[PDB]
Amino acid sequence: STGSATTTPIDSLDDAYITPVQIGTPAQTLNLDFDTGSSDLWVFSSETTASEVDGQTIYTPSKSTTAKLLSGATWSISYGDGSSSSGDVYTDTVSVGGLTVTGQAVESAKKVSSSFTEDSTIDGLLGLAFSTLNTVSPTQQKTFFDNAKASLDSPVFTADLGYHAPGTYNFGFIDTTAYTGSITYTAVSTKQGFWEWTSTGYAVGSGTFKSTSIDGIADTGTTLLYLPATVVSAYWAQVSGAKSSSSVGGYVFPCSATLPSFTFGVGSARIVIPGDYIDFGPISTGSSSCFGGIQSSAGIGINIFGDVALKAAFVVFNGATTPTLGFASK
């Protein structure tokens, strides 16, 4: 089997991407944030504290003839941005782009933090990291990809995120019309439960490429590119007037600037992030200070190849017995 679904930016900055997902019988369609940095499929629901729902579409398990309470199971998750959610668990039928999993754990939120409430466009998350990170207790549950894997034509999914435009998540096949050149594959460590790999270096604009190993994660659920402070300083030094602002929380630059590109290495290959992809617009409405899309990871504990980096490539998440990542230009 295979599946193919369009993913759409939630706003004009590509802050995140939503993909429609069918849950239950008859189908309830919710728009979920596919997150290769976490491993829980959770949704706003009829159980979510009413004051914490503000425009999201909810899953109502009592209206699904295939929903079953997973007795005793609870979940609770906190994300790198400080947001969180928790609740109980149902199993139900879940389909993405024509690909159906029966018995998928659907984690029903009883509570969500303010950032989730305030974003009416995201009805939940669909985690695509490794199932060892799933938070269901006392019986850990599998991701949608892990459950679908055996049925897929090939044990892979691909992320093809658009710049200010829709893109595609495919499951079970590699669309050879979606990229240019060849795909370069690179080793993955699953020791932390992430799609963790080592970039071979970087360049700023037309500058020379610096060969240096940068360990980080491919994370579709993170907006920006978080890299070591040395690398980030080298990038922003090429932008007149750019500075790190503790009050704003990162590097800012004059909105009048033209940003240089940023290149990262995948083995001997190179992925080029155009400068425009690094512009996240005014820090507040009407400001002439703009927020940068490349930021320091020094406060995180890990480097994160988020959407800014991933949307410059066609990305293969290879879930074979020895997982690997593949990157192609497009």
Side-chain angles (χ1 to χ4, degrees), residues 39-62 64-67 69-109 112-141 143-148 150-190 192-198:
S39 302
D40 288 51
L41 194 178
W42 74 260
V43 296
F44 279 79
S45 73
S46 58
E47 302 182 331
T48 309
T49 300
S51 64
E52 298 183 346
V53 184
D54 184 8
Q56 295 81 12
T57 294
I58 61 169
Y59 170 58
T60 303
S62 63
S64 175
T65 62
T66 42
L69 178 75
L70 186 64
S71 187
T74 60
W75 62 280
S76 180
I77 194 168
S78 302
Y79 296 101
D81 68 351
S83 67
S84 64
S85 49
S86 61
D88 56 17
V89 188
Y90 295 82
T91 56
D92 208 340
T93 301
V94 173
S95 298
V96 175
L99 168 68
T100 299
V101 167
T102 57
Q104 174 66 43
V106 178
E107 301 171 34
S108 166
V112 305
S113 66
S114 58
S115 58
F116 290 114
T117 301
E118 289 161 2
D119 184 358
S120 65
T121 72
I122 289 172
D123 302 323
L125 269 63
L126 191 148
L128 294 167
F130 292 89
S131 292
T132 57
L133 294 179
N134 176 266
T135 76
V136 178
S137 179
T139 309
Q140 189 171 57
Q141 302 294 302
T143 68
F144 175 84
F145 178 55
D146 217 325
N147 281 323
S151 308
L152 297 175
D153 292 356
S154 186
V156 301
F157 67 91
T158 64
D160 181 8
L161 304 179
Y163 169 68
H164 296 344
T168 306
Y169 280 100
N170 292 328
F171 292 81
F173 72 106
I174 291 171
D175 181 354
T176 58
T177 74
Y179 60 88
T180 61
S182 55
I183 306 178
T184 297
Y185 288 87
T186 198
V188 162
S189 173
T190 66
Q192 292 191 87
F194 300 121
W195 294 92
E196 188 172 4
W197 65 289
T198 303

Side-chain angles (χ1 to χ4, degrees), residues 241-242 244-257:
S244 181
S245 165
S246 59
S247 57
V248 177
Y251 279 90
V252 298
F253 67 94
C255 293
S256 60

